[PDB]
Every structure is written in C-alpha cells, then in structure tokens.
C-alpha cells in the first residue's frame, strides 16, 4: 500500500496476515501454523537518470506463546542505485541469481519450492550479497537480461574460520560469485540459465558426509505463460551443495521441478506439481533419494486482498536408515488457510 | 490512526507508548516497566454483502538493556470474513469467548483482571482459535448475540504429545470449544452467561496438583453503563482450570469481581473494585486463597490522545507456607503512568 | 515521513535501510554489517498552551541467519508533555543529560563517539529516566537552555540487589540525577557543561578493577558551526565511571575527543577527528590506555534521502598484558557504506 508520495520521495508499507493449520501423522509439523509479514519499500528521485532504492522485510510467527523465544526474523534487507539504461547495483541480504530461474516453479499453494533451503550459498536468501543486473542488454536486445554477484565469506563464531557474523557449519560459506541469464523466446516461451561457484570451509569439511575445495551449481529453465495457462519446468546439479539432512553435504545430486495450472475467469486456480532431489555416493550410504513428492492443490480469489488455499503433499519416500539419521520426514501433509494482505 | 483509504480498502496503524513505574517491597516487580504497542487493522470491500479483514497486535519491553533478550512478543493475529448479516468467522490468535463476558470488570487504570491468566484453555487470548459471530439474532432480536468457538490441541515440545508449536505444561491443552451470550436487558443494563469445555493433556497430569481429564467453565455476568456511571461484577466457578502458582490446577475454584467509577465531565475518572479467588481441595493444602486485594485509583484524560493514572494494590493475602510454595506475592504495589496513543 | 496530520494531532513514520561492510584484521569485527533502524514520532495539541507527545525506535540487525537469535533491541522509548514556555517533561528510556554536551563531537561516517557505551549511567542511552527542561531560560535569556534529571535504581537479577529489571554488573546502577547548561555566545560558537553523579551497587564493588560508593562525571565543551566549517571538540573527566573492557571500571580516567569536517557545495564532505580515553591507579596495573586512534573519512550526500561513504579508523594502541586481559581491540578497520533513509 503507497502511503507517501510527495516531492521525488515515495513509501510502501506492505505484508499479510495468514491464518494456517497443518495436518499430519508427522509430529513435528502437525498443529497451528499462523505467522504475519510486514515490509517496506523506498524510491528517491536523483536526477533524470539517476535514482535510489531500498527494501525491508520482516517475518513474525504467531502460533506460540507470550513467553516463547526466537520468533521473529529478517527476510531481506538491502540499498541501491538504479541507473536508468545502464542497470543497477545493490547490497545487503538479497536473493542469490539461482534463484532467478528456480523461482519459475516456486509458485505452488504452500509447499513446494524446498529442493535447496535459505543461507544455501546462491541458492536463496543469503548475506552479504552484492549484486549488479542489466535489463535489455543495455536498450538494445529485448527481454534478454543478466546478472552477476559476488557475495563475502560467511564463517564460524571463533577460531580461524570466524567472522564478526558466525553462524554453524551447514550455513557457513567462502568468498564466492554467480551469474544468470534469460530470455524471452517469443509468446509467454521463456527460457533461462544460472550458474554459481563458492569456496568451502574448514568446518564444512569436518562434517560426516561431503568432501571438497568448492560447492557448485548448473541450472536450466523453461517456462509458458499465456492464454491463463502456466506451466514451468526447473532442472538443476549440484556438487557439495545440496544439504543432505542433518548430516552434511551431497558429492553430487540431481533436482528437478514440474508445475502446471489454470486460472479461471471466477477465482479459482486449481494446480498440479511433482519434484524430487537425488543424491549420489553418500559416503557408504551409496545413492539415495532425499526428497520427492506429488502436490495437489487450488488456491480461491475474493480479489487482490484476500484468498483461501488448500494444499496436499503426497509423499513419496521410503522410511529407512538414512532417511531416519538425516532426519527427514516421510509423512503426508494437508493446509488449510485464509490470508488477508495489503 | 485511519492512514489509508481508497478504492474499497482501508488500514489502521495504531498503538501506544507507555511511561510506567512500581513501587513495591516485593523486589521482582518493582522498578522500571516502560513498553510500548504496535498494531495493524485492515478492511477491504469485496461484495455488497461480503468484506474481509484482518489485525496484528505487537508488545515491545523497553525497560531493559539493549544486550537483553526475550523483549517482545505477539498478543494478536488473525483473518476473518464478515457476511453482513448472517455473522462473521476469523481464525488465529485471538480471545477466547469467556473474556466477552469477563472483560466487563477488566477496566482498572493497571491492575485487576488476573483471576485467570493468558494462553490458560479459553479464559483469555490463545493460540489455534476459529470462532463464528452472530449479531442480532440475525437482525430479529435487538441486542442478543452469541458465539462458537473450537479450539485445537496445543500438545508438548516432544515425546506424543508434542505439535509443531510444543509450550510447557502450565500452557498446554487439548481440543475444546466454548460459546457466550448477551443480551441489553434495557437502559445501559446488560447481562450475560459464557460456558467452555476441553480436554486436559498427560503432561499435566503428572503435575503436583489437579487431577481430572477435563477443564471447564462456568461464568455469568452483570453490567451498569449509563449518566457517568460504570458499575460491573463477574462471577465465575472453574474445575480443574485456574493456575495454583507455579504448582498446578486447582481441581475446583470460586472467581469473583466488582468494579465502579465515575466520570467527570471535566477529565478525572476516580475507581474502585475488589476481587479475590478461592480454592478448594488442594492435595493436601485444604482449602486456601489464590487471589485477593483492594484497588483504588484514578485517571486524567488530557483528551482521546494523552493521560496519567496512579493504581494502588492494596494486598490482604497473608504469608503462608502455600503462597510461598506456589511462588504467589503478598506485598502491596503503587503504579504511576504517563502514556501517549495513536 | 509524516504520513498522518489532522485534527490536532500528526504522526511520523521514518527510520533507514544502510548497507555495510568492515574490513579488519579483528576477526569479530571483520565482515558484513547490515542493519535497519524503524521509529515512530506522535504530537498531539490540548490547548494553547499544553501538548503531549511520544517517541519510539527500534534497531533489527540483518547480517545473520533466519534462525539466528537475539538480533532486535529498542534504543528509545518515551512520552512527554510540553508547556509552551515553562519547559518539558519526559519519562521512559532516554539520553542522558551528559550527550547534550558530547553529541558535539559525535559526528563521525561510522567511527567515534565511543568513550563511553550505552547503559553506562547517565552518559548515553539509559532505563526510567525523568527529565525536564528548560529553553530560553523562560523567554529571558536567548541561546541559553538546561536540564535537570533524576534516573532510579536499575539492580541485579536476584538476591537483594534486584529489581524486576534486572541486567549484569557493568550495566548496573543505582539511584543518580545530573544536570547540564549550554549558551549560544555568539556567531556559531556554542559551550556547554554538564555534571552527573549516582550511588554504585553491591555487585559493582565485588569486581576485579574499581571501588568507591559513588560514580562521577564533569564535562565541558566547544563548538564552531558556521561558513560549511565544522569545528568541535569535547573533554571529561570520570571517577569509577568508565569501563575498562570486561575487568571493571577505571578508579579515576580523562577521555579527550577533536573533530573537524567541511561541507562542499556539491555534496562531498570529509572528516578528521582524534580521540583517547586514558586511566589512572588500575589496581595494579598502574597507568593505561584504555582506547586512542585516528579517524580519517568522507560522505558523499545525492540528496535528504541517499548517500555513501568510507570510513578509516587508525589505531594507535599498543599489544600488551592489559589490552588483551580486558578485551580492548588493536587492529585497524574499513567502513563502506550505501544508505536509504525516510
Ligand atoms: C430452552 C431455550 C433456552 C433459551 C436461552 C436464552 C438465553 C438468553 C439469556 C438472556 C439473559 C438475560
Ligand atoms: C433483569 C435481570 C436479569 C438477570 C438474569 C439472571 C439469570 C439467573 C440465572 C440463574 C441460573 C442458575
Ligand atoms: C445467559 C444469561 C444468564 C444470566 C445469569 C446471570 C447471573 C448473574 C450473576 C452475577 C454474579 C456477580
Ligand atoms: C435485575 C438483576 C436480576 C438479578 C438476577 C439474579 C439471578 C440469580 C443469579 C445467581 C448467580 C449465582
Ligand atoms: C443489584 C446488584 C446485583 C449484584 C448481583 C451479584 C451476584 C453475585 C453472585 C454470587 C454467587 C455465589
Ligand atoms: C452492585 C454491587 C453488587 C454486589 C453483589 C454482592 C455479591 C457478593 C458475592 C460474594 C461471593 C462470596
Ligand atoms: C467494591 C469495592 C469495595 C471495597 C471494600 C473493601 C472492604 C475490605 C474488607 C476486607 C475483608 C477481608
Ligand atoms: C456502591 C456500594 C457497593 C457495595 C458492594 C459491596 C460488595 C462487598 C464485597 C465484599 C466481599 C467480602
């Protein structure tokens, strides 16, 4: 909602409240689930070419009670400059580039979008990122846009590897960069590639399983969005990068991503997705399976303020040794919500 | 504070800055105890009949040093819709349908409401709470309403009772529900009747007192609003529900309060009330008090933005093996406030 | 931004987005920085004369993990009452008087003012302070203003110390006032004194440096700010006031700060400022240097609402027993900011 304008300055103040429940044999994740969201977005005026920018996202659970701890954090937060044709610079905690094609799949009811998790190097959400993007290859070819990054090391709380910012091992990271790229083929056809490469750590090294210098990644995406129709498609392989549990890292796995929908004129957009993450040589675990589900689900539009969802993960994994030690779940999974935003 | 409205939606940033201070013998309470609250109401338009909405509701402490933790925390959180006539359903954190009839007799300048506490079953704000409104009797009566609500399990952190939002036992709960009703008998005279039932948890079971498999509810109130005058008493009976100190349930309580005041045209708003609670069957304590104390106090409106207030606890409990036990304080208090809301 | 003004009363949302990056040997200060700050301003009018108001401000750190803990605190958090020409009173979490006359020279790019630390008495940001202060003297005198305030007893956790508000040793107190005088002599030439004196605490006098029965400052200082030149310079004198890293406190200290800057037109602006803090009779470790550097920077200003700058702070300390014993870092940093603000 823009709730200032005036004199070349102008203010956001956004978010949502989401009433949720999940249901499930599991546990862990079976039970009330509410949260909120609450965020601000600038823009400052400059010049006629230059201008200033910056963003701010919170997130508050709302699900425990009034004497519980650790319920709150910080999504993104970051400064910029836009420079009208030749692109624009940003610092701070942002997204990773991988995240600029995976994001074509992300796009189910609830769940969805977890084949890499946040602080994963470039995977997702990280800190310390500074990024640079370029939108029509400068004025000249349309719709073709990239984007390079190079984010800081990220290391442990004390010893060597330490950093004024330390957190544990399976979200530390070194000095590292990435890039992606994408284009629009012709109607709603979109294609797209990313690359990233980043040092390891001493700490990461020492972990049960996963063993390297560097952690990388390859990924390539289509997507068709047109005509009320949406259908997308993610492929992505990982060396060192992917987590495997509460364990440590893969030496190599394979994700892949499929989700297709349809909107219909009145509200309702029913949708249909299947993923799974493969590893391979899991240190005397061999090849493995660490995630892989068919999600079923429709989410109701009253309008651009308010909604109603209903998700169903099916899951498709086997209960066994390394499924139990890595501490994933193998449960099935239903929510229910009503979110209210502006 | 109303800082948008257009096009059918509308929102509310409000809340209040506290300047507070105690001064008491009992040397956990006294001292310094500035906070301050931030909230969020939104409004959006979607038929003629229909409309959506939603509220956040945050607490922030200020009186400790900026190196100290556990500070804030959420007080409310929910998303509802409203039918025009045929009532209204939100689900979230909310209050629980007993406060519709006990906050009668919640309106001292700082103490008073505590013969139950928070996240206590549905006796005051809670966790996981869908509840259903009708107005008017649907628009036939003029002045009787009621509500439903049900209520989901809060189990423990781990083990079987464990849920993914896991509190400790004094806080736990199983699936329950509850409904209220009232009516405007005539000239600023009101009268009203809540009742509530659920499921006790293992975990709090093997407490030191209290022993059943059920908690529940019975209340009844009374209320004088009119020429300047405010008159209000409540009485409720519980079994099994309200806390003994940090020890256990009371397997069956006798609740009551009474509080009058008078407003002067002129901005002073002198008060006085009482309340205690009883206990009967202790597991050996017998028959003991809980609660009891005399209130007297007043408070200066400026206007609908600024005021002060003093608050006088004067406690008649005496000291005694059970109040030392159950860790319940015995000293009197002197509270003394300038605030600030928008 | 002011976001709400009408009928008599007006609001204030502002804060800043900053982007930060350290450079440094010190491995617990190397690394990214990014934080955010978020407040809210009220005044309300009451008559010709009266009218009340309220400020609040919050600090959310972005530089770590979404499951990172302990990374919000509020600096700021009271409410008032202004009489027109009579003064002001405020209660609730404030400055200290002593920063009327230090704030002169805190005006560095990221480096300085740090002679003193926060919740260090009345020298800086502290809990349940009343303050009243006075313009004009009354309307009599121009340029002339002081203040008068008295800050209570903020104890330990436990035991007889205590108070509901209870923080560690270093950050203890008990009952003070201080008071503070500044005069505008002619053009842009300003001086200022300003004295404080509070009792000590049980837990205070049970530390390994330090021992008296009351804690004292006297400070004075000198400003030039006119013709885009900046000229300040500030010097106090403390007994048992000042910390000596995580020993205690210094029996007897003088801290000595200069700072000199010039305004460019066309929004440059570079900085040169020297500061130390030197301590006397150390309970056997004689006389030390308890902080001492050289700082050395620039901003760059785009308009009211963007900038950039860089930040060197040269450290002139030497390595030895006492630096390492109480914690005091010797090596160099690098600041590199980009910052939004509203
Ligand atoms: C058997 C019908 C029971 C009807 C109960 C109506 C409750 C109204 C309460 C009015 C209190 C003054
Ligand atoms: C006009 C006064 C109406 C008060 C209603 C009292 C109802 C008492 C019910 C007792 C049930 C046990
Ligand atoms: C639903 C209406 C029930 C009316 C019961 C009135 C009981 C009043 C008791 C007041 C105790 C202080
Ligand atoms: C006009 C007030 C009528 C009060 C009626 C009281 C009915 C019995 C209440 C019993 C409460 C324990
Ligand atoms: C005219 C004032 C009527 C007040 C009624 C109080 C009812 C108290 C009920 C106690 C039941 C044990
Ligand atoms: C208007 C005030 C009504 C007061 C009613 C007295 C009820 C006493 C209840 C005692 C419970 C043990
Ligand atoms: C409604 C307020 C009445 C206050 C009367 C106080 C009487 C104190 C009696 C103490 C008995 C233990
Ligand atoms: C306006 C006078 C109201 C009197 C109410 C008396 C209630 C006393 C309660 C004492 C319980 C022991």
């Given at each position: 909602?823009?709730?200032?304008?005036?004199?070349?300055?102008?203010?956001?103040?956004?978010?949502?409240?989401?009433?949720?429940?999940?249901?499930?044999?599991?546990?862990?994740?079976?039970?009330?689930?509410?949260?909120?969201?609450?965020?601000?977005?600038?823009?400052?005026?400059?010049?006629?070419?230059?201008?200033?920018?910056?963003?701010?996202?919170?997130?508050?659970?709302a699900?425990?009670?009034?004497?519980?701890?650790?319920?709150?954090?910080?999504?993104?937060?970051?400064?910029?400059?836009?420079?009208?044709?030749?692109?624009?610079?940003?610092?701070?905690?942002?997204?990773?580039v991988?995240?600029?094609?995976?994001?074509?799949?992300?796009?189910?009811?609830?769940?969805?979008?977890?084949?890499?998790?946040?602080?994963?190097?470039?995977?997702?959400?990280?800190?310390?990122?500074?990024?640079?993007?370029?939108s029509?290859?400068?004025?000249?070819?349309?719709?073709?846009?990239?984007?390079?990054?190079?984010?800081?090391?990220?290391?442990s709380?004390?010893?060597?590897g330490?950093?004024?910012?330390?957190?544990?091992?399976?979200?530390?990271?070194?000095?590292?960069?990435?890039?992606?790229?994408?284009?629009?083929?012709?109607?709603?056809?979109?294609?797209?590639?990313?690359?990233?490469?980043?040092?390891?750590?001493?700490?990461?090294?020492?972990?049960?399983?996963?063993?390297?210098?560097?952690?990388?990644?390859?990924?390539?995406?289509l997507?068709?969005?047109?005509n009320?129709?949406?259908?997308a498609?993610?492929?992505?392989?990982?060396?060192?990068?992917?987590?495997?549990?509460?364990?440590?890292?893969?030496?190599?796995?394979?994700?892949?991503e499929?989700?297709?929908?349809?909107?219909?004129?009145?509200?309702?957009?029913?949708?249909?997705?299947?993923?799974?993450?493969?590893?391979?040589?899991?240190?005397?675990?061999?090849?493995?399976?660490?995630?892989?589900?068919?999600?079923?689900?429709?989410?109701?539009?009253?309008?651009?303020?308010?909604?109603?969802?209903?998700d169903?993960?099916?899951?498709?994994?086997?209960?066994?040794?390394?499924?139990?030690?890595?501490?994933?779940?193998?449960?099935?999974?239903?929510?229910?919500?009503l979110?209210?935003?502006?």
């Amino acid at each position: 909602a823009e709730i200032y304008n005036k004199d070349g300055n102008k203010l956001d103040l956004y978010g949502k409240i989401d009433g949720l429940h999940y249901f499930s044999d599991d546990k862990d994740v079976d039970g009330d689930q509410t949260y909120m969201r609450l965020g601000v977005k600038g823009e400052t005026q400059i010049n006629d070419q230059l201008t200033g920018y910056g963003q701010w996202e919170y997130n508050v659970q709302a699900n425990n009670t009034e004497s519980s701890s650790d319920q709150a954090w910080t999504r993104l937060a970051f400064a910029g400059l836009k420079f009208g044709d030749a692109g624009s610079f940003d610092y701070g905690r942002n997204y990773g580039v991988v995240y600029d094609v995976t994001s074509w799949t992300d796009v189910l009811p609830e769940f969805g979008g977890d084949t890499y998790g946040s602080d994963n190097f470039l995977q997702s959400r990280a800190n310390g990122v500074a990024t640079y993007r370029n939108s029509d290859f400068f004025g000249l070819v349309d719709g073709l846009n990239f984007a390079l990054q190079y984010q800081g090391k990220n290391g442990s709380v004390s010893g060597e590897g330490a950093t004024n910012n330390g957190r544990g091992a399976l979200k530390q990271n070194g000095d590292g960069f990435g890039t992606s790229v994408t284009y629009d083929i012709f109607d709603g056809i979109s294609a797209g590639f990313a690359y990233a490469n980043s040092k390891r750590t001493d700490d990461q090294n020492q972990l049960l399983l996963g063993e390297g210098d560097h952690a990388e990644t390859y990924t390539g995406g289509l997507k068709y969005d047109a005509n009320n129709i949406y259908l997308a498609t993610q492929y992505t392989q990982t060396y060192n990068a992917t987590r495997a549990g509460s364990l440590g890292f893969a030496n190599k796995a394979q994700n892949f991503e499929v989700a297709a929908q349809y909107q219909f004129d009145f509200g309702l957009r029913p949708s249909v997705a299947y993923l799974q993450s493969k590893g391979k040589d899991l240190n005397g675990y061999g090849d493995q399976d660490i995630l892989k589900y068919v999600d079923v689900g429709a989410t109701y539009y009253f309008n651009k303020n308010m909604s109603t969802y209903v998700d169903y993960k099916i899951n498709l994994l086997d209960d066994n040794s390394f499924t139990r030690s890595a501490g994933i779940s193998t449960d099935d999974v239903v929510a229910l919500g009503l979110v209210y935003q502006f």
